[PDB]
C-alpha cells in the first residue's frame, strides 16, 4: 500500500539517473527521460521486451539499483493479491 | 481458482485496448488482436521474448495495467502450486 510509493520514487530516480549515465556513450538509446521511465518500469516489473537497456558501466549500476529496489518494491503485487483475495 | 478468471478478462481487455492505442503509430507492430493476445500473455507471464511491444504512450499504459493486473492475477501459479502440492 505504501511500498507503491517507493516504487514511483525509484522508477523516477532510476529514469533520471539512467539518462545521466548513458548520454556520452556512443550508441546508447537510454537518453531521454520519457522512454527512460518506460525502461524503469520494464525493469522493475521485470517483463522482458528487450527494446531498451544500458551500455555504460554506471548505467548498469542504476540498472542494478532499479532491479533491487524495484523488483522488491514491486512487493506491491501481493497487496493487490490480498485485496483481490478478500473482496473476491 | 477464480483469479484465473480475472486473468482472461485482462489478457482480453489488454489485447483489445493495446491494438487501439498502437494503430496510428508509424512502425508499431502491436496492431492485430490475435498477436496482441499473444503479447498480453507474454506480459503477464512476464516471460521475455521481446518480439512484441508498444511504442505509443497510451500503449505503454495498457502495458502497465496488464503487468499489474496480470502479473498479480498470475497469482494463479500458486493455486496450481497447491493442488500440485497436495495430489502429489
Amino acid at each position: 500500500g505504501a511500498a507503491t510509493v517507493l516504487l514511483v520514487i525509484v522508477l523516477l530516480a532510476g529514469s533520471y539517473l539512467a539518462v545521466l549515465a548513458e548520454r556520452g556513450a556512443p550508441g546508447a538509446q537510454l537518453i531521454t527521460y520519457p522512454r527512460a521511465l518506460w525502461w524503469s518500469v520494464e525493469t522493475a516489473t521485470t517483463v522482458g521486451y528487450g527494446d531498451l537497456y544500458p551500455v555504460t558501466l554506471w548505467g548498469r549500476c542504476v540498472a542494478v539499483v532499479v532491479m533491487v529496489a524495484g523488483i522488491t518494491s514491486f512487493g506491491l503485487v501481493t497487496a493487490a493479491l490480498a485485496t483481490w483475495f478478500v473482496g473476491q | 481458482g477464480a483469479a484465473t478468471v480475472l486473468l482472461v478478462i485482462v489478457l482480453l481487455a489488454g489485447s483489445y485496448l493495446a491494438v487501439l492505442a498502437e494503430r496510428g503509430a508509424p512502425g508499431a507492430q502491436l496492431i492485430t488482436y490475435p498477436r496482441a493476445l499473444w503479447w498480453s500473455v507474454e506480459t503477464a507471464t512476464t516471460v521475455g521474448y521481446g518480439d512484441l511491444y508498444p511504442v505509443t504512450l497510451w500503449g505503454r499504459c495498457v502495458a502497465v495495467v496488464v503487468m499489474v493486473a496480470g502479473i498479480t492475477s498470475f497469482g494463479l501459479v500458486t493455486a496450481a502450486l497447491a493442488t500440485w502440492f497436495v495430489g502429489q
Partner: antibody
Amino acid sequence: QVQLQQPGAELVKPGASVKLSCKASGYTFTSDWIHWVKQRPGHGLEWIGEIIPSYGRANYNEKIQKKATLTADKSSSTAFMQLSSLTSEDSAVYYCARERGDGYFAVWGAGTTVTVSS
Amino acid sequence: DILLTQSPAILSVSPGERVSFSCRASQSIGTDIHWYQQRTNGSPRLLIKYASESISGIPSRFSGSGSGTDFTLSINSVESEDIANYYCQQSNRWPFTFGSGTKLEI
C-alpha cells in the same frame, strides 16, 4: 520573452581563447540540457556538446577535435562554453539551444559570431 | 554514430506547389527525427517533432511522415516565406546528429 540570450560577437586573436555565454529565462527543469552548435558560413549545423545544469555533467562530440569546455552557473541560470587555442577554422556562429531532455531543441539562441583574426 | 542524408541539397518548386524534403538515416531510428527551418541570417526553428508531431505556432501547411530509416518533411502549397534551409536531426542514439540540409528554391 527571449528564452536564451547570447552576445552578438567575439573577436579572438589566433591562439587565444574565449568564453561564450548563454543566459536562459522561462521555465527551468532539472531535466533541461543546454546544447551548443557550430555553423560555419554557408555550411550546416554541427553539434559540439551538451551540459545538464542540474548536475553539471558535460558530453562532447567525439568526431571533432575538442575545442570547448562547458560549465553552468545555476544561480545566474547561465551556461558557458570556453573555446581555447582558436584558429580561423574556429571562426563561425555558435548557437546555444535548450532541450527538455526529450530529444529536440525547443528553442535556440540568436547565436554568437566568433571571428578568429589578428 | 547515425548519419543523416538529405538529398537533393536544393529543391526547386513553383509557387503554391507541394514539396517534399527527404531524410534518410544510416540505421533505423524509429520516429526520433525532428525538423528545423533556418532562414538567411536567422537561427534554427523547430517545425516538426518525432517525425510527424505538430508544433504550435507553425502553419498547418507543414507536415511530416515516415519511420525507420526514411523520413519526409512536406509543405502543402509553398510560398515565399518558406524559402530557407531545412535540417533534420535524430535523437534515437547518442550523440544527436544533424543532416546536411536542403535549401528550398522557388
